[PDB]
Amino acid sequence: AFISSGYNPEKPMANRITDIGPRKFDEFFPPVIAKNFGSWLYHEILEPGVLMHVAESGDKVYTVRVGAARLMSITHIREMCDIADKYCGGHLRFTTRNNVEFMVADEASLKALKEDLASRKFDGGSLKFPIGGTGAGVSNIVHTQGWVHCHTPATDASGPVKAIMDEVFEDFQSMRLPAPVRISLACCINMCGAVHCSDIGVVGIHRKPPMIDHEWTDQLCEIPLAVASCPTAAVRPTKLEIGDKKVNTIAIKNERCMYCGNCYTMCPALPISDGEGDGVVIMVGGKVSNRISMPKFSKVVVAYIPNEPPRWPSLTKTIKHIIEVYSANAYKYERLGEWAERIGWERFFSLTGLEFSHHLIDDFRDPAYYTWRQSTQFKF
Amino acid sequence: AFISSGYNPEKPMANRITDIGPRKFDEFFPPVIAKNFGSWLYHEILEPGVLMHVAESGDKVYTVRVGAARLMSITHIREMCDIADKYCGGHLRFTTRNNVEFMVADEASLKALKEDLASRKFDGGSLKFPIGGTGAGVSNIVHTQGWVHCHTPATDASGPVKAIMDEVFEDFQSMRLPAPVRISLACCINMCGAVHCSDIGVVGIHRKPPMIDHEWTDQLCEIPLAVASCPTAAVRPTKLEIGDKKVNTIAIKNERCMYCGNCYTMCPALPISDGEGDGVVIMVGGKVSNRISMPKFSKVVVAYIPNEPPRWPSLTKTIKHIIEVYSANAYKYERLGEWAERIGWERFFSLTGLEFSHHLIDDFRDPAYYTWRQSTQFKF
Amino acid sequence: EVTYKGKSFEVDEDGFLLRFDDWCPEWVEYVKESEGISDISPDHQKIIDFLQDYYKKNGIAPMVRILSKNTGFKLKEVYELFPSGPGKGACKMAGLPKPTGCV
Amino acid sequence: EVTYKGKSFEVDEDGFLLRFDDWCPEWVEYVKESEGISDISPDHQKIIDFLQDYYKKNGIAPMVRILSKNTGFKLKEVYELFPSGPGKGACKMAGLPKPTGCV
Amino acid sequence: AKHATPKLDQLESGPWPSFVSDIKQEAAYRAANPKGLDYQVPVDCPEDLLGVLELSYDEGETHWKHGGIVGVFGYGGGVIGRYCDQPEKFPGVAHFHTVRVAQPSGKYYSADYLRQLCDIWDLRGSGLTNMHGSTGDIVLLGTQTPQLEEIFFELTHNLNTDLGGSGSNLRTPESCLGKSRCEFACYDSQAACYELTMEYQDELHRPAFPYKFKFKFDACPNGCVASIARSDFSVIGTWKDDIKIDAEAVKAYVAGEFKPNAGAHSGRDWGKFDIEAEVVNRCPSKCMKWDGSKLSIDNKECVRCMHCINTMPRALHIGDERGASILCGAKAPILDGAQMGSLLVPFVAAEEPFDEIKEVVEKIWDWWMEEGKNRERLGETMKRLSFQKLLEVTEIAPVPQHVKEPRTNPYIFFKEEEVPGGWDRDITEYRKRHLR
Amino acid sequence: AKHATPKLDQLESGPWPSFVSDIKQEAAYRAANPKGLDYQVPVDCPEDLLGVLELSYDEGETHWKHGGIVGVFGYGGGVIGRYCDQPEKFPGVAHFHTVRVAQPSGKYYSADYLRQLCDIWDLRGSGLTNMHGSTGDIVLLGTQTPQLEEIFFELTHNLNTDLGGSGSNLRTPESCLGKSRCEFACYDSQAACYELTMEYQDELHRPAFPYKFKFKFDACPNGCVASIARSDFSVIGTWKDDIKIDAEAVKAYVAGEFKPNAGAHSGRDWGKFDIEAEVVNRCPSKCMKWDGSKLSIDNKECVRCMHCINTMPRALHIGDERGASILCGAKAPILDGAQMGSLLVPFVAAEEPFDEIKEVVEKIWDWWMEEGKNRERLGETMKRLSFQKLLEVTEIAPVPQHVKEPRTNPYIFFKEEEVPGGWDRDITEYRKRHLR
Numbered sequence A, B: 001a002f003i004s005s006g007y008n009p010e011k012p013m014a015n016r017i018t019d020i021g022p023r024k025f026d027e028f029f030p031p032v033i034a035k036n037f038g039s040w041l042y043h044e045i046l047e048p049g050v051l052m053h054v055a056e057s058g059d060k061v062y063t064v065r066v067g068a069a070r071l072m073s074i075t076h077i078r079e080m081c082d083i084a085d086k087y088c089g090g091h092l093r094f095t096t097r098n099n100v101e102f103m104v105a106d107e108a109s110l111k112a113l114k115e116d117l118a119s120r121k122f123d124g125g126s127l128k129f130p131i132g133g134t135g136a137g138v139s140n141i142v143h144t145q146g147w148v149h150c151h152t153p154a155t156d157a158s159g160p161v162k163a164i165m166d167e168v169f170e171d172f173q174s175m176r177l178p179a180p181v182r183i184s185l186a187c188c189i190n191m192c193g194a195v196h197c198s199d200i201g202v203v204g205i206h207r208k209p210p211m212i213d214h215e216w217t218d219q220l221c222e223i224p225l226a227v228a229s230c231p232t233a234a235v236r237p238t239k240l241e242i243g244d245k246k247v248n249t250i251a252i253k254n255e256r257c258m259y260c261g262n263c264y265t266m267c268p269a270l271p272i273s274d275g276e277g278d279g280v281v282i283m284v285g286g287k288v289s290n291r292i293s294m295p296k297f298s299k300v301v302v303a304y305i306p307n308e309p310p311r312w313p314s315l316t317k318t319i320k321h322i323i324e325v326y327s328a329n330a331y332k333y334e335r336l337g338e339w340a341e342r343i344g345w346e347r348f349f350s351l352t353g354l355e356f357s358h359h360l361i362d363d364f365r366d367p368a369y370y371t372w373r374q375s376t377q378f379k380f
Numbered sequence C, D: 001e002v003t004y005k006g007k008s009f010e011v012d013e014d015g016f017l018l019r020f021d022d023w024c025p026e027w028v029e030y031v032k033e034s035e036g037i038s039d040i041s042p043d044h045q046k047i048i049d050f051l052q053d054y055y056k057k058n059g060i061a062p063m064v065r066i067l068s069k070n071t072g073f074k075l076k077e078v079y080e081l082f083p084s085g086p087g088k089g090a091c092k093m094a095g096l097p098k099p100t101g102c103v
Numbered sequence E, F: 001a002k003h004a005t006p007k008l009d010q011l012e013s014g015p016w017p018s019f020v021s022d023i024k025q026e027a028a029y030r031a032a033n034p035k036g037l038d039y040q041v042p043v044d045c046p047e048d049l050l051g052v053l054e055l056s057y058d059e060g061e062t063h064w065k066h067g068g069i070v071g072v073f074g075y076g077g078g079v080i081g082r083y084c085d086q087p088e089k090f091p092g093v094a095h096f097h098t099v100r101v102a103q104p105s106g107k108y109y110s111a112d113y114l115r116q117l118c119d120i121w122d123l124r125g126s127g128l129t130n131m132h133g134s135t136g137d138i139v140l141l142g143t144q145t146p147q148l149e150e151i152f153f154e155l156t157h158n159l160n161t162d163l164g165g166s167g168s169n170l171r172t173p174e175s176c177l178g179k180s181r182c183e184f185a186c187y188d189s190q191a192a193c194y195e196l197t198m199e200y201q202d203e204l205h206r207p208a209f210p211y212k213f214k215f216k217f218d219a220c221p222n223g224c225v226a227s228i229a230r231s232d233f234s235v236i237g238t239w240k241d242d243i244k245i246d247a248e249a250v251k252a253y254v255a256g257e258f259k260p261n262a263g264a265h266s267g268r269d270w271g272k273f274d275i276e277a278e279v280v281n282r283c284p285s286k287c288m289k290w291d292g293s294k295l296s297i298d299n300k301e302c303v304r305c306m307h308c309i310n311t312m313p314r315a316l317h318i319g320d321e322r323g324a325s326i327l328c329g330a331k332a333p334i335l336d337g338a339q340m341g342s343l344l345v346p347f348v349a350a351e352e353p354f355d356e357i358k359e360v361v362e363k364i365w366d367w368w369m370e371e372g373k374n375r376e377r378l379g380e381t382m383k384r385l386s387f388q389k390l391l392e393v394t395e396i397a398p399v400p401q402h403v404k405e406p407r408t409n410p411y412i413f414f415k416e417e418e419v420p421g422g423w424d425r426d427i428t429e430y431r432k433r434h435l436r
């Protein structure tokens, strides 16, 4: 039973509002925020998930950071709105890692807010609003669409993220590491998000070249685009006979293909996904902050871990172990990447016990050479 | 006035001796050397140019290192042979930096050897055997052929080397630097020698694309070789009409040419040298030892210094100044490259006063990106 | 898949022709209304013609800046003619392959 | 530059023909002695023929490993036929351009 | 439809908030329809999503068809169309388009604003969202094409909110929380973000670029929005003068009254605060000094890494001469390798209405829009055409900070007008002194 | 001929030994001919060289014609022909070929041997040399082609010495002085060098490679022959066990009895030896400890950089378990950029007759000789075909020390055998679960 919103399909451009952008940033600021905007002096992390900011006026704001699945219902949003109305004057915030923050201007409200949040659970038993994600621990996982919405993934996002957070949960609620550890996940090498610049990155990979739908190559795709989309120039135009019919199609040099899947992004006739072939790689040692060392890219340390829905045990076990040895060895303030670099990647491999395979050696173009070892300086 | 050596041109392969190699390495060892081979315990640098090695047997060997122009007459070699016969039992050595070493087994011989060497001079007044080249100073300059024998240079070798050594001479005879400074020179980008891995490197460069001898291109050259010899793919085969005659020749995309001169190396019809265009670049910060830091490549810091025979004042002045500021700033044992990297290349430029031009920014392929600054970490 | 004035058209969920060769002037009339167009002016035809010429000659859709330069129609003008844009609008009506990548 | 049996040859200081086209079977006879060869056997001719075929077809002299593979003559055998080697010897006698690079 | 989900059910256990449990609750809420809503899309939409997801988990492969081109009149992007590859098996998600909605910079909301948004999505959507997309957008996950224009109308007319960006355009910009709740903020990152968002509404809604382009604003080098890694045009806050030192405050840290890093490491016993070992010796520039009573800083050698400040936020503060650096070309791997932003402008004024920043952006677009190749990110155009070209088009003179290190190779290009005699030379002249 | 050399004359002043003065003296010696020699080449040869050099200084351009192909029967290289571009103006150097003569490893000579060599060059050469070439060869600078076979005959028959290498072959190998005169030597670098030189005489004299190839032998990481920068196949000495520590000797250094770095820094006042600041704190691995009386080393974390040893050569010594590392691919810029040797084999036995080393060389040549492109250095073949391919042909398993850091990009190649189902898949099978 159709319900118009006032939109007139007959006059599509009538009453059309455009270029209004989002609501101005300061529109929904809590009063204490708006008043003390740009006049903060210092802050304290009262405990995992709780912060306090002190303004020049003496005014204080308390922040309670809570975990969230990112992918959420309007039912859940409404519940948070209820909580916000109860303790925060109807105000709330989302972080850059998709955690939720509730702010109050007094200690008593803070105490009631936290006790309430900590008590809520989903029927299935999981915590609705676990408090934490602060300081030197493991916060939320920056992630993507996976099998929930994307056509190019090689793994899921929501599933593995839940499986990982369950495994490292204690670190979401405590600050016991040498430095914060950022975990990000992406379902394909497009690396939407932050995997390429995180302490620990999980990326979905393929291990087989794409299949070629010859009947549709020249119909559905712009062949020259597919040719220009290959980082290794494995894609080339070709002609193939089919049922007394010659067609313009594509040829792929399997030996030159590294299954990036980019040709499929450009051409629907080049499907690549594979249940058994698909898996995940683990990259470690990236960072975006300029603190102490310059920002770093994460490096591939595990060439392949198979998809094991719905819990991805191998993935999670491996991630937990990496955090364990990093935590037991790194200096205070030392990011995972800084630690691995200081000790030498060969010591990172021996301490972690991770296997070093031929896959880990860069072979992509001229820059690959600079990743090799031009020195006798190395530990046995 | 032909004088045969016994060689019979009529019977070239008669009495032909081949594949004998050089004289076995240990054949001309001094007795003390041969006896104590591989049984040395420690050594001392008694003074600039003088060393002492102590063997497990208690035996001692004293070494006197002396400068040399590398390019030398048999007359000079004979003089050294005389000196060797007088004090060293007829034995002598040449170093990897083309200095000469005279060894004795007692202190009295050592005293007489040095006083003799230090007294000899060429008619023009230059020292024949200046003693030095040890420890933390400036030793001999590893160099090339220049205008004395090569067809591809963009500068001279012997001339500039003499001009430089005269300017930094005091450092050849003393050990006052934070660490040894290696100076190397090459007449073209082929960088024969060690310029690309020295504390200070001087390399001859061109600033104009090659000329094309169209009448001889297809006659004197293997065109495909010339095409494959360009790092920037500026070289391409072409056809040109000349006096009612079409010829197979070469075309060069001037805007893609960086005057490396490699196409001339391969094809005589592509001369490139130019009196006014040619000059020298200065590179600094390289090192081959694995001591403290891994080996380093030298980096371009001066895009162009014109050729000024016969003394190359600008070249020498600049080199001396670089050594001065490095010496006044670096820590003990700190190589020039280590120092520049520790303080940041921007502080190296400001302290040295060297101009930073657009030429210094790498623009060659994918690796160029990694030389840029991906961080907010920088000094004003 | 879709029928119009006795003509059968094989199309995808987005309403794009699966084959450039299956295109005919009638496809334009059938699609226009869905793309916010009532009358196909000469400026519409000019844009459609260009896309078709470029595709037949190059095997690819032209870049937006190329469409504008050759056509003389600035982006604003293009949107006035084709409300949904050069991709969803003009390319669909011209019979070119559906735009791909991260749209 | 150089004359032989009544005919003239334009050559360089190294004794190489300036032009492949100026080559003739007589050039081989004139050059041989200077290259440590008294009689031009069929094995000599085989090598000479190959170089010429390869050059006419490719515009370059073949790599040593290519000469050996196509010719069947291992490097040792090549040097027995041409004492000064495949470059200074066979290439010169075959009329190919003088080898370049850091030789 | 109702399906069995034995695999997904296992993701309902564990502590971390479960997306499965949440999707189930939304499914249950729609089925109950306590508000008597006339659902514009299948009531079982969320259940069908769970049905498809279970299938994908079973087969280990996505079940969404390739691409999709849907949208709203007047715009070229903002909606990510998607169609299930087994529409009869899961009709609830036969059409499962995503709508990107423009969010406020720093994402501060009111319960009332969010409720109105939910009300809109409840009736015309699946009831599922993403808060938020990695680019910053509010994401309305799943609806049908006929609802697209209806939602847009309600968004613009009722919610007074626009759509976000998608395609080869200027995507939705985002910033760190900045001055709103941080003592480290060197400039108003939220205002810059909102200002530029409004300034370039046309470029955002109507793709006119060779490829996508992103802006991200960090108020200090800590990089809370990760602009250096996730935006083609990164604006990172900084200061030009000295770090402010509160002498009494540092003594208080040394005395153990103030907690190191605001207590960020309270979960473990790191011993007592050692200012010398924890800050002085950790300074990358080694420009700090601790004489047993007073801490000093050789500011001219400070690289403003933030370490000392992050460690003693009560004692050490950013300078008073504030602004920002502009870094360009960050992008994911495809095609030529991952890039982070390369420093373009070391220090630029960063105060409203931020004209100096806009000027740079526009000079970059003028060049890249015309010279950039199809589907070529700015970072790749920089690699291909050179950092020198970028400097030239932005009218910025070369400076040592533009480089981490000078070039190693000698393949140097020179400008013809700078070399005496130019490049046109006569071989016959040369041949006069150098015979063949 | 006698020419004016006003420019070159200025290079006769100053302290450094003058090449001009030396060339003049050789010219004067030949003119005097005190031995009544029947000079095989122009007596004024050296004067004409000075004449050409002055001209080049005047015009700022070389006066040597392009290339030159001269040699000796039986060999493919060893002689670098050269012809003046103005032969009528400077007839003494119309032919100015260079002869490369094989030198002893480490360059230890006897006055008698050198005398005989000079006698040969006196009569058939210009009297000028290069001691030595950058590759290690003795260089006889300047002669005429008719003398080539005459010199070779005298060299082989009288001097019992061969020619060195040139062209696309195995060039003359060289080594540091090694065990002959250094307490740091981990293996007999001179013997390895001589052994391999003799082993591969054929590859050296008769070019069979795609390009040039060099061997260099350093008996320790200090790299006195610079094998890591100037040889395609670098052999650098090392030890596997602990560094030897002489407790009394270290006290003597601390006491100031022994000079730091053997007195290498005696020219300046660096203050008193500070073992903690000068060695402990300079160790890159930070694996050393000084408790005020004793120095210890965590050898498992030592990267054997040589710093501590170079600094206290009397107290610290190399280990007893000696061998060497093999690094590959160093080369100058042309074509694809400068390269240094990349670690291939971390530890290999390095004792005569050095079969283990030879085995690696030969496995490398087998591959590169066939797969290497024309004029492609090994380093470039490695870049093009991958470090993985080099490991495969040498039968070396991948090890973390083969890398300075793992790859950043995810463009990973897998061996088809490693992947379930291989690469042959049928679209119609896939199309069954994923409709178009």
Ligand code: SRM
Pocket: A143, A144, A145, A149, A150, A151, A152, A190, A191, A192, A193, A194, A265, C101, C102, C103, E067, E080, E082, E098, E100, E132, E133, E134, E135, E136, E137, E138, E164, E172, E212, E214, E229, E230, E231, E330, E331, E332, E333, E334, E335, E377
């Ligand atoms: C295309 C697709 N992406 Fe996406 N993507 C989101 C965000 C990112 C970010 C992080 C950021 O913007 O902060 C990156 C890395 C930084 C960068 O811009 O490179 C990112 C990467 C890409 C690439 C690679 C680009 C390159 O290599 O130069 C592509 C391929 C291409 O352009 O052809 C690609 N992305 N992406 C985020 C947006 C949400 C929002 O508006 O805030 C995601 C929705 C992930 C998330 O869940 O947060 C997102 C996902 C996607 C794919 C659409 C997902 C969907 O089904 O809705 C898409 C469009 C794949 C496609 O349709 O072909």
Ligand code: SRM
Pocket: B143, B144, B145, B149, B150, B151, B152, B190, B191, B192, B193, B194, B265, D101, D102, D103, F067, F080, F082, F098, F100, F130, F132, F133, F134, F135, F136, F137, F138, F164, F172, F212, F214, F229, F230, F231, F330, F331, F332, F333, F334, F335, F377
């Ligand atoms: C060609 C020519 N070189 Fe030469 N070259 C000598 C030595 C070196 C070294 C150092 C070393 O061997 O220890 C290098 C750098 C390391 C490396 O092998 O790359 C070097 C470089 C080159 C290149 C570049 C090679 C590349 O980029 O991959 C070429 C160009 C090419 O191969 O086509 C090149 N060189 N070279 C040294 C040898 C003396 C000896 O036998 O000991 C020199 C005589 C320099 C010296 O004075 O010590 C030397 C010089 C030359 C040129 C010949 C000089 C002459 O006139 O005799 C030559 C042959 C240029 C040419 O003929 O085209």
Ligand SMILES: C[C@@]1(CC(=O)O)/C2=C/C3N/C(=C\C4=N[C@@H](C[C@H]5N=C(/C=C(\N2)[C@H]1CCC(=O)O)[C@@H](CC(=O)O)[C@@H]5CCC(=O)O)C(CCC(=O)O)=C4CC(=O)O)[C@@](C)(CC(=O)O)[C@@H]3CCC(=O)O
Pocket: A043, A045, A051, A065, A094, A095, A096, A097, A098, A099, A133, A134, A135, A136, A139, A140, A142, A179, A180, A182, A194, A197, A198, A286, A287, A288, A289, A290, A291, A333, A335, E106, E175, E176, E177, E178, E181, E182, E183, E184, E222, E223, E224, E225, E226, E261, E264, E310, E311
């Ligand atoms: C809420 C956030 C901002 C937003 O929403 O707009 C936010 C708040 C604060 N940040 C602050 C400190 C600094 N931040 C990081 C940097 C990282 N922080 C971002 C994230 C956020 N920061 C959001 C929250 C995300 C989440 O839910 O958890 C990242 C972006 C990302 O991960 O993708 C990012 C880059 C990560 C990287 O380097 O790789 C950094 C350097 C760390 C180091 O090197 O050691 C410190 C220095 C330090 O810790 O002492 C405080 C102290 C600033 C203040 O108030 O005085 C705030 C409180 C911090 C806290 O709670 O412990």
Ligand code: SF4
Pocket: E176, E177, E178, E179, E182, E183, E184, E185, E186, E218, E219, E220, E221, E222, E223, E224, E225
């Ligand atoms: S980037 Fe800096 S100013 Fe912005 S929230 Fe993070 S710490 Fe604060």
Ligand code: SF4
Pocket: F176, F177, F178, F179, F182, F183, F184, F185, F186, F189, F218, F219, F220, F221, F222, F223, F224, F225
């Ligand atoms: S490389 Fe090492 S062993 Fe050889 S001479 Fe040099 S310091 Fe001694």
Ligand SMILES: O=S([O-])[O-]
Pocket: B192, D102, F135, F166, F167, F212
């Ligand atoms: O002689 S150069 O080719 O090494």
